[PDB]
Design a protein around this ligand. Structure first.
Ligand code: ADN
Ligand code: ADN
Ligand code: ADN
Lengths: 263, 260, 258
């Protein structure tokens, strides 16, 4: 199957034309949209969403990831193979930073085989349709990776301050704010569990100059309606939520904001 | 096939990983999204959307319904088979109220067979992915109902105000993209008011009253005018031709409406 | 395959039931959503989106186009085949204006064969589900065009001002999610050369913009004029929102001077 992730939006016809190109190449291709609502050009956000979603896709899955503000420039178009046997077709702009770091890099190829393109002369600003989609389509069809082009020894990496445990607390950043307003950080709940904390404990969540108390719980309903809670999200990350409410509003936080959780 | 309905939104990756899990259990599963934009936690809205959508799905359809604010709590995870031969995989929180009342209940099973789960250790807040989705996939693929778990004799029901005639009185059930206001009032029940097409009735919402023409199509009235008619599911719906009824009437779902 | 375009939105269950209907007629039907977020009743916007998307769909593609404010009225329901071998199932309200003009019309049939319907008695306001969807499904299965109904020798046309060159002038056709402003001006006509700086006039205000190939060819936040993925001249702000910066909306007149 092909996992599809972009910042194109479902309002425009861009997603549909890319799917048409894929289906023209392989009528039997299975395309699963991860999301097409990544905020415009937000590669940092996309890198996180990609990793978390990839955890639920099987080995051999080909991911079409296109959040490409540098489309048409000298930035490289690449295909990465992670040590967990998954494939990623994307621009070399750092969007593959998290999967590369979490799964390990097995091999990286630059897309040079023009025979895999949808058009002889790709549009200057829509490589997603003319280069990335068809390449993902061919790979998902059995095309050997080596046929995409020559290997690369490096790839662009997004500078990120790794979440660490230091003196009774864990420091990190807000990675994703979902539809409910739940605030998921880049702090692994396992890392958080090294602060010798447990469900039913109460910890302090610090955002900027504010400090909130929050119960460590398993489910939203484990606290009264409207109350804050700290729990592990579906991908194993520490998330802050408000039962039947919006944590991003209560904390007044947005993606990228530094967040601290004291024991 | 599988009818998918949630309050997860299409912006998050939640819907995609759920479909991936389903596709992993059954590569040829046909998944049709009813909607994933149900307002967060709004089980009442979902209960109506579910029923109206189900009317166009064939018998044997397995519906995956997940608007589950109680995920991870003691609330039951169930599978309901209605008398019209449709199956519903959902939390026991009242979201299946309308399909239960309209189609009647044939059987109810509590999801207990852990071998039907996606992961050995289900997440505390994403049963949609770890329990409901895979169970819906297995069911849509043949799995006998008895393989789900023990039977249940009752299910949580959403308290509702059954629409009656005496004028007609009901509630706004769904406000769609266009702002059309669909009620829980069957258009047939309304016709038992000696009313007829072309007649002008009065719409009473809150403390305001409007004049509305009984018509068949939006274009049967001048642009911007209010009309009362049967929507695609047989329910009385109020709309503004080339306009937004919800804005004009300044009404929201759950709102009580009166037609004299 | 079927290209699906409407103004129904993805929030409502309408799109879903329409797809269920297509699938019941043909379980193997391949449905590709072009968009369901066309502004309500905006047939003009839909006509441009339909054409631009259709350029990337193969011949023999069946397009289900339903932006039908006149649903339930005397407006005709039709099936149009264009000379580029694509089929369009839609209301006769001008939504097919652009594909008809750009590709040329091969034939038009009024939908009269009721055996192609979803139900004997179609709803008054959801022909998308009861008439258009099933018809598109059948055509996609190989149903001969002559089996749809009788031929029509005309169709409703949305009058439109054609862009020119004298500096060139045109109108904003589509503003995408990024805020990029795509016009109805073919970038070929426009072709001045890349790297030159031109003037963009949007009513009373004027802006300077670089003619470039990639958004990144200018500095962050700067304006550029380039060909979009369909070949139309588009105005964009690198890493920004041109629609906001230019304070323009679809339908607005746009001028570009050397
Ligand atoms: N105005 C813009 N500035 C920079 N990048 C853009 C702009 N519009 C679209 N893109 C990028 O084009 C890519 C698709 O080719 C998208 O992933 C998007 O990030
Ligand atoms: N902050 C929250 N409070 C209560 N329920 C929630 C919250 N966030 C998500 N959910 C529920 O989790 C379910 C998915 O597991 C969704 O159907 C949603 O209703
Ligand atoms: N209030 C309304 N006025 C006019 N047309 C409408 C209204 N609501 C829905 N429609 C049309 O009904 C069609 C679907 O049957 C849609 O394409 C939409 O344009």
């Amino acid at each position: 199957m092909i996992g599809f992730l972009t910042d194109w939006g479902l309002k425009s016809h861009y997603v549909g034309v890319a799917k048409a190109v894929i289906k023209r190449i392989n009528p039997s291709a299975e395309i699963i949209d991860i999301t097409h609502e990544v905020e415009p050009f937000n590669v940092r956000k996309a890198s996180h969403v990609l990793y978390r979603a990839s955890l639920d896709f099987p080995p051999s899955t080909v991911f079409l990831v296109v959040v490409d503000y540098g489309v048409g420039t000298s930035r490289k178009a690449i295909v990465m193979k992670t040590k967990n046997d998954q494939y990623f077709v994307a621009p070399d702009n750092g969007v593959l930073t998290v999967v590369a770091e979490e799964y390990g890099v097995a091999e990286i190829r630059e897309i040079e085989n023009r025979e895999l393109f949808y058009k002889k002369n790709p549009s200057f600003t829509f490589h997603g349709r003319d280069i990335f989609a068809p390449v993902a389509a061919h790979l998902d069809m059995g095309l050997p990776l080596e046929r995409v082009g020559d290997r690369l020894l490096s790839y662009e990496v997004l500078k990120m301050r790794k979440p660490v445990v230091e003196n009774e607390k864990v420091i990190g950043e807000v990675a994703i704010v979902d539809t409910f307003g739940n605030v998921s950080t880049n702090i692994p709940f396992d890392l958080f569990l090294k602060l010798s904390v447990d469900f039913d404990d109460v910890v302090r969540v610090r955002v900027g100059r504010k400090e909130f108390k929050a119960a460590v719980a398993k489910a939203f309903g484990d606290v009264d309606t409207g109350e804050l809670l700290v729990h592990p999200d579906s991908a194993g990350f520490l998330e802050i939520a408000v039962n039947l409410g919006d944590a991003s509003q209560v904390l007044s936080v947005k993606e990228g904001d530094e967040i601290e959780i004291c024991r």
